[PDB]
Design a protein around this ligand. Structure first.
Ligand SMILES: CCCCCCCCCCCCCCCCCC(=O)OC[C@H](COP(=O)([O-])OCC(O)COP(=O)([O-])OC[C@@H](COC(=O)CCCCCCCCCCCCCCCCC)OC(=O)CCCCCCCCCCCCCCCCC)OC(=O)CCCCCCCCCCCCCCCCC
Ligand SMILES: CCCCCCCCCCCCCCCCCC(=O)OC[C@H](COP(=O)([O-])OCC(O)COP(=O)([O-])OC[C@@H](COC(=O)CCCCCCCCCCCCCCCCC)OC(=O)CCCCCCCCCCCCCCCCC)OC(=O)CCCCCCCCCCCCCCCCC
Ligand SMILES: CC(C)=CCC/C(C)=C/CC/C(C)=C\CC/C(C)=C/CC/C(C)=C/CC/C(C)=C/CC/C(C)=C/CC/C(C)=C/CC/C(C)=C/CC1=C(C)C(=O)c2ccccc2C1=O
Ligand SMILES: CC(C)=CCC/C(C)=C\CC/C(C)=C/CC/C(C)=C/CC/C(C)=C/CC/C(C)=C\CC/C(C)=C\CC/C(C)=C\CC/C(C)=C\CC1=C(C)C(=O)c2ccccc2C1=O
Ligand SMILES: CCCCCCCCCCCCCCCC(=O)O[C@H](COC(=O)CCCCCCC[C@@H](C)CCCCCCCCC)COP(=O)(O)O[C@H]1[C@H](O)[C@H](O)[C@H](O)[C@@H](O)[C@@H]1O
Ligand code: HEM
Ligand code: HEM
Ligand code: HEM
Ligand code: HEM
Ligand SMILES: CCc1nc2ccc(Cl)cn2c1C(=O)NCc1ccc(N2CCC(c3ccc(OC(F)(F)F)cc3)CC2)cc1
Ligand SMILES: CCc1nc2ccc(Cl)cn2c1C(=O)NCc1ccc(N2CCC(c3ccc(OC(F)(F)F)cc3)CC2)cc1
Lengths: 524, 161, 166, 524
C-alpha cells in the first residue's frame, strides 16, 4: 500500500524507531514464556469481566427468587445471588463465560507463581533488576487479593463464611485499631448493607487499574533493560544471542497466545467450577463441611488451622490468637520483596550481571528456595484436612498434629537433601568433563578385561585419553543419541518410501546446514 | 520460516560522561538561576503552606469513612449500649418474655414457632432464635421485616442440647 | 570531545547540551541586576504573604472539618442556620487555600525566575531516505522470505479459518 | 542526592532522554492552555468519582426511606435514590464532593467546546494534524454521552423523564431495528430492573477507560508532532520559539492546575447544583415543569422541540417524528470529524503547515464557524422556552415560532455580517501599515489646517512620510501607549517613595534588558 505508507511517512516519519524495534533480539529459551502465560491470562480476564459486568447487580437487599431454577423457588436471597443465578441459568452462554473467568483467574495465579520460581532460582534479580523484582512482588500480592474479592462477590454460603471468618474476625482482633478498621470497612457490624457494592467497586475498577499500570511498568523495564541469557557457546555479558522480533518472535508469541486461549476455553467448557446453585444464599445460622478458599489463600487458612491457641490477657484487655496469623502473613509479605538486598548484604557481591546461573551452581540459594516451597506445600495441605481425612482414612487430630510438626521438621530436612543433591549434580558434571561421554558399550580386551568405550568431547593426547576440559557454566551432554550418533531414518511419509536421490539430497543438505550453523556461532 | 541467529550489542552501564555532565549542568543552572537557595522566607512559607493544604485535604478525604464503634445506639433496659455488646437476647423493658422459637422452613404463616420441653429426645440438638411474641407471624410487611432481621443476626443462634 | 571535558564551566556545558539537542537559548537575563534594594525585599514579602495565607486557611479547613456542626437539623422550630453554612465553609476554605498557593507560585515565576527565549529546530517532514529504504527493505525481506506469497492454499485456508473463528 | 542519582544512572542510564525532554521548547500564548483546562477537569473528575464509588448502590429495588430527611420519610423509593440521599445527608462532606463532581463535569464540557473553537478558527487542523482532529471529535462525543449517563444515575423524577423520553422513545422509533435495540438495551419494556446497574458499569468503567486511552494518544501525538505557532518576528515554518520545559513550563502548568482546582472547589462549595431531595423518586405518573438536561444536550432537546410534526404512514407501518432528530443528530456527528478533508477537497491545498492563521485572514471559514455557533445558540435557547416565557413575559407559542424561524434566518445573516467584519478588520490593518499609528494629537499649522501627527513604524522618505510596509501575518499596534510612549511611574511602594539612585538604576537596567531581548530575537 505504497500511497498510504508514504503519506504516513511524510506525516510522522518514524522509519527509524520502527527499524529500531523490528531488529530487537530476544533469547529463545522455553523458560522465558512463563510470563507470557500470565499476561495472556490477564487479557482473557479483562475481556470476560467486561462481558460479565453487563448482567451483575451488586446489592444486598432481600428478594424472593421466583425464577427458573425450581429447587430454590420461594427462598429469600440477596440481589447479587439472584443476579448470579440469572447469569447462570437465563443468559445464553453465561455459565460458560463465568467458568472461563474463574479458570483464567486460577491460571493467572499459578503462572505467576511458576514465573516467580524461575526468576528466583536462575538468579535474574541481581544488580540491574532489584526494582523489577519489587514490582513483581507487588503484582503478586495484588493478584491474590483481587481474586479473593472476586470470588466473594456472588454472596453464597461458602463466600459468606470466608468473608466473615477471615476479613471480619481477623480485622476485628488487631491490638489497638481493630474495631475501628472493622467499622470503617464494613460501615458497622459484619453483615451490613455497603459491603458488596464496595467490593464490586474495588474489584472491577481500582485493583485492575493498579495492576494494569504495574504491568505496563514491568514490561517497559524488561524492554529497555534487555533480557538476560544462559551461558553458552557465543554468549557474553555484552551481547544478546537469539532471534529478531521481525519475522519470528511476534509469530511465536501470537501462536502461544492462541494456544493458551484454546486450553482455557476447553477446560472452561469441560470442567465445572464454583456451582453456586448447589449452595444456598448466605445465612449466618447454617454452615457446611468443606469451607476452603481458592488455592492461593489455602496457606493462610492452613496457618490459621495449625497455629496453637496462645492468647494474652492483661489488665482490662485481650490479645486473641489470629493476631499471630496477622503478623506472620505480614512478615512473609515483607520478606518477599526485600530478598535481593538481604542476599547482597550477606554475600557481599555488588556487580552487574547479565548471564544467568544454573540452580545447581548455587547450592545455598537452591536449598533456601526448596525449603520455602516445602513450607508452602505443608501449609497448603494442612488446609484440606477434612478432605484428606475423609477420602484417605486418617484421623483428623492426627492430620492436625502431622501438620503442626511437619511445619518444623520438613523444611530443614528438605534443605539438607537439596544441598547434597546440588553438589552431587556438580560432581556428575565434572566427571563427564574429565573423561568422555559414556556410550554403554562393553569390550573384553583379550586378557579378560572389561572397558566401557567413552567418547571424548575435545582433543586427545598421545595415548588416546582425552585432555580434561574446563567448566564454562553450560550444560553438558550425557546421552550419545543427543549428539548425532544414531539418526537419519528413512525419508518416506509413513508407509511408502521416497526415491533414493531425494533422501540423499535432503540428508546431505541438512548435514551441511547444521555444520554451518555450528561453525558460524563458534567463530563470533 | 528461515532459521536465524542474531547479536544485539547491549551497550549497558553508566551513560557517556558527555550526557551526565550536560544534564547535571542543566539541572543545577535551572535551580541556581531561580535564586531560591538564598530566599529562605519564601521557601519555608511555601513548605508550610503546601503541608497544611495537603494535610487538611487528606483529612477531609478520609474523614467520611471513620465511625465510632462505641456510640450507644441500641436501646436496652439500662439505657443504650454499643452494638458489640447487645445480642438480640437482650431484654428491652425489664421483664419481657423471649421465647426459644425454632425455624420451620416454610412461609405460609410460621417461620418461627414456640417449643415445649417434650419436643426432643435425650440425644437431640436444635437451633433456636429469640421470638418476642410482639413480632408476630410473617403476614404483614412490618412483621416480615422484623422476622427477616431476627433471622440474620450474627449473635442470635443458639444450640439446645 | 575529549577527556578534558572537565575544567569547563557551567555555561559552556549548558550551551553544549543545547546544541546537542538543537536548542539555542537566546537572551537569558536575571531579574535583579542591582544588589539588595527595597523593591526586591518588597517583592519577596509580597510573594511570601500569599503562601502564608494559603497555609493558614488550609489549617482553617482542617479545623472547620473537625469541629463544625454538620448533621441535618432542618425544621421550622429550631431554625439552625449553622447547618446551612456547613458546605459553604468547606468550599470557602479549601478553594481559597489552594488558590492562594497558586497565586503565590505565579507571582514567584513572574518576578524571580529569569526571563528567557529559546528556539527548537523542528526537523519536520519525511524521513531521511536512509531510514525509509532500510525499513522498507526489512519489511519486504521478512515478507518474501517466508515464501507465503507462492503458497496460495495455506494463505486462503488461514483466512477462512480466522474469519470463521472471529 | 549523589549516591542515589548515580546508582540510578548505572542501572538505567537515561541521561539522554531526560536531557532530550528537559530541553523541549513550548510556545507561550494564552490561547494554548484551553486544553490544559479540560485535562485538569478530567483529573478532578477521576478523583472525585473514585471517592463517590465507595458509597453508591446501583439497584432498582424498592424500599421505604426511613432516614434523617423528614419530608421524605415513609416514601417508597429505589435503592439508588436512597444511596444518593445517604451520600447527601449522612456522610460528612459527601454533598460537597458530589457538587464538585457535577461542577467539574460542566467545566469539562465547556473547556472542550472552547478548545474546539480555537482549533477550528486558527486553522490548526491542516495537513499534519487531521487525525488529531478526528481523535478530538471522538473525545467530544464520548464526553457528552458520559455526562448524560452520569447524571441519570441517582434516578429521580427529572433524570427519569430524561431517560424515558430521549433514550426509550427515540430508540423505540427507529425504522426497522427499533424495538429490537430497545429490548436489547433495557432488557424489556422501559422501566426494567437492569437499566441502572448497566448504566453504572458503563459510566464508571468503560467510557472512562476509552476516554483515558484516547487522551493518552492525543497528548502523545501533540508531543511528537511539535506545537504550532503564530507568525511573528523570529518565527518560521522550521523552528519553535518559546520557553524550555526545564525551569518554566512545568512551573506554569502546575500553577494553572492549582488555580483551576481552586476555582472548582470554590464554586462547588458556594453554588448549589442538582438538589435531588427537592425532587422525588421517579414515578411514571407524575411530572414537573422544567424538564431540561445539562447544557450539552440542550441542543438535542431544542431540536426535538422546534421540529415540525412530519410523519409518514404507509402500508401497515409508521415512521414517527423523532426519526428526524435521529438523522439530524447523526449528520452533525458525521460532519464534525470529516471537515478537514472537505476543506482540502474544496480549496485544493495539500501542503504542510506549522504557522497558524489569524481568523481575520480567512473570511469564509470564520463566517462558516460563526454561522454554526449561531445555529447552536438558537438550538440551545429554544430548549429553555418555559423559563424564558415565564421570567420574560413572552408567549410560549411565540417562542416556539421564533425558534422555528430563527433556525433558518439567523445563520445566513450571521454569515454575511461576519464576512464583512473580517474584511473590515483587514482594511483597518492595511491602513496602519500604509500610514503610521495615530497618536490623537491635533495641530493647527499656521495657515489654519488640522493634522493628526501619525507615528511611523519603519523608515521614512525625504519629505517625512513613512514608506509603506508589507503585511507579514502578525498583529500590529494601534494604541501609542502599548508601544513604550508614556510609562515609567515612580518606584516607591504605594505611599512612600524610594531613593532617586535606585529609581534611575532600575529604570535604566530595565530599558537595557528590553532592548537586548528585542535585538536578540530580531537577528536570529
Ligand atoms: C495511557 C494513559 C496515559 C495518560 C496520558 C499521559 C501520557 C501522554 C504522554 C505525554 C508526554 C510523553 C512523554 C514522552 O514521550 O517521553 C518519552 C521519552 C522518549 O524520548 P525520545 O527518545 O525523544 O522518543 C523516542 C524517539 O526518539 C522518537 O523520535 P521521533 O521524533 O522520530 O518520533 C517518532 C514517533 C512517531 O510516531 C508518533 O508520533 C505516534 C505516537 C503515538 C503512539 C501510540 O514514534 C514514537 O517514537 C512514539 C513513542 C511512543 C512512546 C510514548 C507514548 C506513550 C503514550 C501512549 C498512550 C496510549 C496509546 O522517554 C523518556 O525517556 C522520558 C524520560 C522519563 C524516564 C525517566 C526514568 C528514570 C528511572 C526510572 C526508575 C525506575 C522506577
Ligand atoms: C477508535 C480507534 C482510534 C480512532 C482513531 C481513528 C484513526 C484516525 C485516522 C483518520 C485519518 O486521517 O485517515 C484518513 C486519511 C486518508 O488519507 P488522505 O489521503 O490524507 O485523505 C484524502 C482523501 O479524502 C481520503 O480520505 P477519506 O475521504 O477517505 O476520509 C474521510 C473521512 C470520513 O469521515 C468520517 O466519517 C469519520 C468516521 C466517523 C463516523 C462516525 C462517527 C460517530 C462514531 O474518513 C476518516 O475520517 C477516517 C477515520 C476512520 C474511522 C474513524 C472513526 O489518512 C490520513 O490522513 C492519515 C493516515 C492514517 C494514520 C493512521 C491511522 C490508523 C488506521 C485506523 C485504524
Ligand atoms: C477530599 C475533598 C474535600 C476534595 C478532593 C478533591 C481533589 C481534586 C483534591 C485535588 C488535589 C490536587 C492534587 C491539587 C494539586 C496541587 C498542586 C499541583 C501543587 C503544586 C503547585 C505549585 C505550588 C508547585 C509547582 C508545580 C511544579 C513545580 C511541579 C508539579 C507539576 C504538576 C503538579 C503538574 O501537574 C505538571 C503537569 C505538567 C508538567 C509539569 C507539572 C509539574 O511540574
Ligand atoms: C465511537 C462512539 C463515539 C460512537 C457512539 C456510540 C454510543 C452512542 C456511545 C457509547 C455507548 C456504549 C454502548 C458504547 C459501548 C462501549 C463498551 C464499554 C466497549 C468496551 C471496550 C472493550 C470491549 C473492552 C475489552 C477489551 C480490552 C479490555 C482488551 C485490550 C487489551 C489491553 C488493554 C492490553 C493490556 C496489556 C498491555 C499493557 C501490554 C501489551 C503487550 C506488550 C506491548 C507486548 C508484550 C511483551 C513485551 C512488552 C515484552 O517486553 C516481552 C519481553 C520478553 C518476552 C515477551 C514480551 C512480550 O510478550
Ligand atoms: C485520618 C484520621 C482522621 C479522621 C478523623 C475524622 C473525624 C470523624 C469523627 O470525628 O468521628 C468520630 C471519630 O473519632 C475519632 O477521633 C477518630 C480517630 C481515629 C481512630 C482510629 C483511626 C481509624 C482507623 C481506620 C485507623 C486507620 C489508620 C491506621 C493504619 C491502618 C492501615 C489502614 C488500611 C466518631 O464519631 P462518629 O459518630 O462515629 O462519626 C460519624 C459517623 O457516625 C457517621 O456514620 C458519619 O457518616 C461519619 O461521617 C461521621 O460523621
Ligand atoms: C484481573 C484479575 C481478576 C481476577 C483474579 C478475577 C477473579 C474473579 C473471580 C474468581 C470471580 C468469581 C466468578 C465466579 O465465581 O462466578 C470474579 C467475578 C467477577 N469478575 Fe473478576 N477477576 C479479575 C478481573 C476482572 C475484571 C477486569 C472485571 C471487569 C472489567 C471483572 C469482573 C467480574 C465480575 C462482574 C464478577 C462477578 C460476576 C460473577 O460473579 O458471576 N473481573 N472475578
Ligand atoms: C502479573 C504478574 C507478572 C507478569 C505479567 C509478569 C510478566 C513478565 C514477563 C512477560 C517477563 C519477560 C519474559 C520472561 O521473563 O519470561 C518478566 C520478566 C521478569 N519478571 Fe515478571 N511477571 C509477573 C510477576 C513477577 C514477579 C512475581 C516477579 C518476582 C517478577 C520479576 C521479574 C523479573 C526480575 C523479570 C526479568 C527477567 C529477565 O529479564 O530475564 N515478575 N515478567
Ligand atoms: C477531552 C477532550 C480534549 C482534550 C483533553 C484535549 C487536549 C489537548 C491538548 C492538551 C492539546 C495540546 C495543547 C494545546 O493545544 O493547547 C491539544 C491539541 C489539539 N487538539 Fe485537543 N483536546 C480535546 C479535544 C479536542 C477537540 C474537540 C478537537 C477538535 C481537538 C483537536 C486538537 C488538535 C488538532 C490539536 C493540535 C493543536 C496544535 O498542535 O497546535 N482536541 N488538545
Ligand atoms: C469522565 C467524565 C465524567 C463525567 C462527565 C461525569 C459526570 C457525572 C455527573 C454530572 C454526575 C451527577 C452527579 C450528581 O448530580 O450528584 C455523575 C455521577 C456519578 N459519577 Fe460521574 N462523571 C464522569 C466520570 C466519572 C468517573 C470516572 C467515575 C468513577 C470512577 C464517576 C462516578 C460517578 C458516580 C458513582 C456517580 C453517581 C453518584 C452520585 O450521583 O452522587 N464519574 N457523573
Ligand atoms: C483464617 C483464614 C480463613 N479461614 C477460612 C475458613 C473458611 C473459608 Cl471459606 C475461608 N477462610 C479463610 C480465608 O478466607 N483466608 C484468606 C484471607 C486471610 C486473611 C486475610 N486478611 C484480611 C486483612 C487482615 C488485616 C487488614 C488490615 C490490617 O491493618 C494493618 F495492620 F494496617 F495492615 C491488618 C490485618 C489480615 C488478614 C484475607 C484473606
Ligand atoms: C429529545 C431529547 C430530550 N427531550 C427531553 C425532555 C426532558 C428532559 Cl429532562 C430531557 N430531554 C431530552 C434529552 O435528554 N436529550 C439528550 C439525548 C437525546 C437523544 C439521545 N439518543 C440516544 C441514542 C439514540 C440512538 C440510538 C441508536 C441509534 O442507532 C441507529 F438507529 F442505527 F441510528 C441511533 C440513535 C439517539 C439519541 C440521547 C440523549
Amino acid at each position: 500500500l505504497a500511497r498510504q505508507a508514504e503519506d504516513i511517512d511524510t506525516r510522522y516519519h518514524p522509519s527509524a524507531a520502527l527499524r529500531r524495534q523490528l531488529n530487537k533480539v530476544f533469547p529463545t529459551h522455553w523458560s522465558f514464556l512463563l510470563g507470557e502465560i500470565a499476561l495472556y491470562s490477564f487479557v482473557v480476564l479483562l475481556i470476560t469481566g467486561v462481558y460479565l459486568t453487563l448482567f451483575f447487580d451488586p446489592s444486598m437487599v432481600d428478594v424472593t427468587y421466583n425464577g427458573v431454577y425450581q429447587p430454590l423457588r420461594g427462598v429469600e436471597m440477596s440481589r447479587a445471588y439472584q443476579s448470579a443465578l440469572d447469569i447462570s441459568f437465563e443468559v445464553r452462554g453465561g455459565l460458560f463465560v463465568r467458568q472461563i473467568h474463574h479458570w483464567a483467574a486460577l491460571m493467572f495465579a499459578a503462572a505467576i507463581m511458576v514465573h516467580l520460581a524461575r526468576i528466583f532460582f536462575t538468579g535474574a534479580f541481581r544488580r540491574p533488576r532489584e526494582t523489577n523484582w519489587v514490582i513483581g512482588s507487588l503484582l503478586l500480592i495484588l493478584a491474590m487479593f483481587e481474586g479473593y474479592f472476586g470470588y466473594s462477590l456472588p454472596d453464597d454460603l461458602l463466600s459468606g463464611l470466608g468473608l466473615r471468618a477471615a476479613l471480619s474476625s481477623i480485622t476485628l482482633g488487631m491490638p489497638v485499631i481493630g474495631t475501628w478498621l472493622h467499622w470503617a470497612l464494613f460501615g458497622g457490624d459484619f453483615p451490613g448493607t455497603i459491603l458488596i457494592p464496595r467490593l464490586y467497586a474495588l474489584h472491577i475498577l481500582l485493583l485492575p487499574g493498579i495492576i494494569l499500570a504495574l504491568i505496563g511498568l514491568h514490561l517497559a523495564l524488561v524492554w529497555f533493560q534487555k533480557h538476560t541469557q544462559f551461558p553458552g557457546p557465543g554468549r557474553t555479558e555484552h551481547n544478546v544471542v537469539g532471534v529478531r522480533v521481525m519475522p519470528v518472535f511476534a509469530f511465536k508469541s501470537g501462536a502461544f497466545f492462541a494456544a493458551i486461549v484454546g486450553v482455557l476455553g476447553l477446560m472452561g467448557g469441560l470442567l465445572q467450577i464454583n456451582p453456586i446453585w448447589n449452595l444456598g444464599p448466605y445465612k449466618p445460622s447454617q454452615v457446611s463441611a468443606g469451607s476452603q478458599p481458592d488455592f492461593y489463600m489455602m496457606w493462610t487458612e492452613g496457618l490459621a488451622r495449625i497455629w496453637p491457641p496462645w492468647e494474652f490477657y492483661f489488665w482490662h484487655h485481650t490479645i486473641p490468637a489470629p493476631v499471630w496469623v496477622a503478623v506472620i502473613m505480614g512478615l512473609v509479605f515483607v520478606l518477599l520483596p526485600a530478598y535481593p538486598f538481604l542476599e547482597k548484604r550477606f554475600t557481599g557481591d555488588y556487580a552487574h550481571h547479565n548471564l544467568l546461573q544454573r540452580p545447581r551452581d548455587v547450592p545455598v540459594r537452591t536449598a533456601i528456595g526448596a525449603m520455602a516451597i516445602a513450607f508452602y506445600m505443608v501449609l497448603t495441605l494442612a488446609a484440606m484436612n477434612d478432605i484428606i481425612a475423609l477420602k484417605f482414612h486418617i484421623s483428623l487430630n492426627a492430620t492436625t498434629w502431622i501438620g503442626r510438626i511437619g511445619m518444623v521438621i520438613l523444611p530443614p530436612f528438605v534443605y539438607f537433601i537439596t544441598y547434597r543433591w546440588c553438589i552431587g549434580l556438580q560432581r556428575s558434571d565434572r566427571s563427564v568433563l574429565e573423561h568422555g561421554v559414556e556410550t554403554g558399550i562393553i569390550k573384553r580386551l583379550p586378557h579378560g578385561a572389561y572397558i566401557e568405550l567413552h567418547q571424548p568431547l575435545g582433543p586427545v593426547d598421545e595415548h588416546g585419553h582425552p585432555i580434561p576440559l574446563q567448566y564454562q557454566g553450560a550444560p553438558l551432554p550425557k546421552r550419545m543419541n543427543k549428539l548425532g550418533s544414531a539418526g537419519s531414518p528413512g525419508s518416506g511419509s509413513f508407509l511408502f518410501a521416497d526415491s533414493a536421490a531425494e533422501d540423499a539430497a535432503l540428508r546431505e543438505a541438512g548435514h551441511a546446514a547444521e555444520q554451518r550453523a555450528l561453525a558460524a556461532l563458534r567463530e563470533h | 520460516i528461515p532459521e536465524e541467529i542474531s547479536i544485539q550489542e547491549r551497550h549497558d552501564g553508566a551513560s557517556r560522561e558527555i550526557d551526565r555532565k550536560t544534564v547535571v549542568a542543566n539541572l543545577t543552572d535551572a535551580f541556581e538561576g531561580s535564586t531560591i537557595r538564598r530566599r529562605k522566607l519564601i521557601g519555608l512559607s511555601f513548605g508550610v503552606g503546601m503541608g497544611a493544604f495537603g494535610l487538611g485535604t487528606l483529612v477531609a478525604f478520609a474523614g467520611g469513612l471513620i465511625k465510632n464503634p462505641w456510640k450507644p445506639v441500641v436501646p436496652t433496659a439500662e439505657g443504650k449500649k454499643a452494638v458489640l455488646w447487645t445480642s438480640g437476647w437482650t431484654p428491652r423493658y425489664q421483664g419481657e418474655t423471649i421465647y426459644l422459637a425454632r425455624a420451620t422452613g416454610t412461609e405460609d404463616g410460621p417461620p418461627f414457632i414456640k417449643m415445649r420441653p417434650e419436643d426432643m429426645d435425650a440425644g437431640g440438638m436444635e437451633t433456636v432464635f429469640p421470638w418476642r411474641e410482639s413480632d408476630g407471624d410473617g403476614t404483614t410487611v412490618e412483621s416480615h421485616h422484623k422476622l427477616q432481621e431476627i433471622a440474620m443476626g450474627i449473635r442470635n443462634p443458639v444450640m439446645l442440647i | 570531545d575529549e577527556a578534558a571535558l572537565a575544567a569547563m564551566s557551567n555555561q559552556e556545558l549548558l550551551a553544549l547540551g543545547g546544541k546537542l539537542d538543537g536548542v539555542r537559548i537566546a537572551y537569558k537575563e536575571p531579574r535583579w541586576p542591582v544588589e539588595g534594594t527595597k523593591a526586591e525585599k518588597r517583592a519577596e514579602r509580597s510573594v511570601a504573604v500569599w503562601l502564608l495565607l494559603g497555609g493558614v486557611f488550609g489549617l482553617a479547613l482542617l479545623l472547620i472539618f473537625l469541629f463544625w456542626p454538620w448533621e441535618f437539623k432542618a425544621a421550622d422550630g429550631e431554625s439552625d442556620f449553622i447547618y446551612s453554612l456547613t458546605t459553604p465553609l468547606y468550599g470557602l476554605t479549601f478553594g481559597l487555600s489552594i488558590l492562594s498557593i497558586a497565586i503565590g507560585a505565579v507571582l514567584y515565576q513572574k518576578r524571580f525566575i529569569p526571563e528567557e527565549i529559546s528556539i527548537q529546530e523542528r526537523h519536520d517532514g519525511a524521513s531521511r531516505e536512509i531510514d525509509r529504504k532500510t525499513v522498507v527493505a526489512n519489511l519486504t525481506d521478512a515478507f518474501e522470505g517466508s515464501t507465503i506469497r507462492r503458497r496460495k492454499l495455506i494463505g486462503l485456508s488461514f483466512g477462512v479459518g480466522m474469519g470463521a473463528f472471529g
